[PDB]
Symmetry: C3
Subunit: 147 residues, 3 copies
């Protein structure tokens, strides 16, 4: 609908380049606009995080040219095809994407990174419960070792 450095904007705003924000990024999290509010399983959140594969990579020059970014800057993230098998809520199909040389990539996948970070919050909550359980099992051994 509104594209910066680009034509064919599927989403409300598409930025072919970097975004520099002085303030913060806000999202509507008010309860009064929600429904089907169910509790998450933090144990399942830690499992999906531990299966995820983080990679160092760089963008192909043919893609970086048509996307307004640099191919020489190192990147660190995830593979959308691998995350889709683990957390498909964080992956979307955005149709075709044409590179700078004319190569058309059909069914190009994008990733909602904030969804992964939210999953990481629940993973920390699970780690907090596991370490607290380990400290209890450690405390029984220490009290048993001084008797």
């Amino acid at each position: 609908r509104v594209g910066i450095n680009t034509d064919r904007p599927d989403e409300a705003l598409v930025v072919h380049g970097n975004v520099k924000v002085m303030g913060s990024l806000m999202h509507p999290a008010d309860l009064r606009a929600k429904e089907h509010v169910q509790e998450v399983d933090t144990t399942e959140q830690l499992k999906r995080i531990s299966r995820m594969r983080l990679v160092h990579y760089r963008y192909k020059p043919e893609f970086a040219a048509s996307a307004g970014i640099e191919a020489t800057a190192p990147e660190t993230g995830v593979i959308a095809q691998e995350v889709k098998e683990i957390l498909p809520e964080a992956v979307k199909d955005t149709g075709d994407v044409v590179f700078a040389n004319g190569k058309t990539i059909e069914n190009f996948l994008v990733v909602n990174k904030e969804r992964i970070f939210m999953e990481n919050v629940g993973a920390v909550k699970e780690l907090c419960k596991l370490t607290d359980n380990l400290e209890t099992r450690i405390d029984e051994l220490e009290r048993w070792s001084h008797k």
Copy 2:
């Protein structure tokens, strides 16, 4: 000030829809624009993370219509009213919000998710110190068990 798919933009940029970014999101973190720099308490950061409640939810169709998003896509996040009692720095009141049916929601709350993720970084730093303390208490038991 500048709104996409929307009127009444309270903030510098309001996007009623999704944002697709090819590059990265940058923030001004230079020291020379900061003051009142105080150390954080990672122990307090882990406590606020462990109290937070992650929920699976979906947006009401009346809200999703007036916000340029879909009601059928599953979501995972936080309740702004619940985070405000835990981390009020991450919650802001944005005034009134009118749904697609005319229902006016006064004192609508938004959430800065990056503030929660930053809090999660300090929670990991606290978990790193707790597990290192547990390994020391484990190491004393193992060396005591071989004597």
Copy 3:
């Protein structure tokens, strides 16, 4: 190239203020646009996270005025000069920045916070492996204590 509340936009989009997004932020993580895909060392990711320094701070009024943000709102983040020594992939030099009083700050540093959060994901994966190793060493002590 496109600036909101600002002149001199170095990047594709610069927002002097806050950004309110109804939907999600998406990034191109498709494998077919990647190269030099190497595995990350989660042990190195936990080390860089544990060295990082989180601070509470507020923006100087002279900077907040020229950036479209408030100086009275509390902030929590990182020092770009300190992160650059730890994770230089997350820091960029954006040239000169002039405050509201005329003070020119040369070599102003910005931070990609999502790069830090991605690093935090690998830190959780390392904590998951350490706690699992501690539970094994605890389990040997418990089975040895009942013989």
